[PDB]
Paper text:
Here we present high performance ultra-low affinity genetically encoded calcium biosensors named GreenT-ECs.
It revealed a structure in which the ß-barrel of [name] is opened to harbor the minimal calcium-binding domain of TnC. Within the TnC domain, the two EF-hand loops with two bound calcium ions and key regions linking the TnC domain to [name] are visible.
Residue numbers in the entry: 11 to 67, 70 to 269, 276 to 299
Amino acid sequence: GSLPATHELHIFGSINGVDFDMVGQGSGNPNDGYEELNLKSTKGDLQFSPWILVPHIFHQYLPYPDGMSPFQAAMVDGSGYQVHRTMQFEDGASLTVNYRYTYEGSHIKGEAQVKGTGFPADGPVMTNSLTAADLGWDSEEELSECFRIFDFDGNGFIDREEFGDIIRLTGEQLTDEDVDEIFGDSDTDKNGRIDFDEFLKMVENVQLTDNNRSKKTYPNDKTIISTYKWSYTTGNGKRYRSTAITTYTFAKPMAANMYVFRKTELKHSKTELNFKEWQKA
Ligand SMILES: [Ca+2]
Ligand SMILES: [Ca+2]
């Protein structure tokens, strides 16, 4: 009958055939979408980047804009759900994370069974050289190429004239004054031109590239499939890209009655990690 306040996780399995096992406890705020979790290895030093466990490491904490998410609803009514998470990486590797949960009041006890295969032995996962994880495939380098296409006069800034052909990329029908408003809001230093730093922020604010799009489909009344593009930052700053497919199976049909803006942080040694997640208000 309760939304969650605390949780624990046992996450274990194998990566490239080598077993791992981690345990720990955390907490969160289901009204705001905040989570924090500590995990410790029980089998010695991790042999792979724990960033690949992100975002997998509790949607019972993650609300919708207008109220409870279906995941929260299924905890509150007791019926629950199970999760089959998959991630397909640009190098052919794959990761499966299967979740089950039990509830004791506002406490969630989670278990995630993991199987990762096909990671190159000398790549950033198996040598622990990832440094961040983010929704979407955009990089600053790819957005630089876009900026340069539309900077017609070549002066290093997007002016109001040049901005029209950029904002078209949303596909939305916008009046001249709709565009004026977006332009003004994007020109945060009020010099009449959009510089590259302002352009990066505009891309996120208007979802020019749909970088934060998270698509849900409902194959049947007990299933949600969430799918999205994902990336990790590597040691030379370049992106390591993947595709996520998460299938939720609910015990009871969901009640008859989009973009994701979350940040993650992971501090990690070989034996312990501290994870935090924040959802934009
Ligand atoms: Ca220009
Ligand atoms: Ca400006």
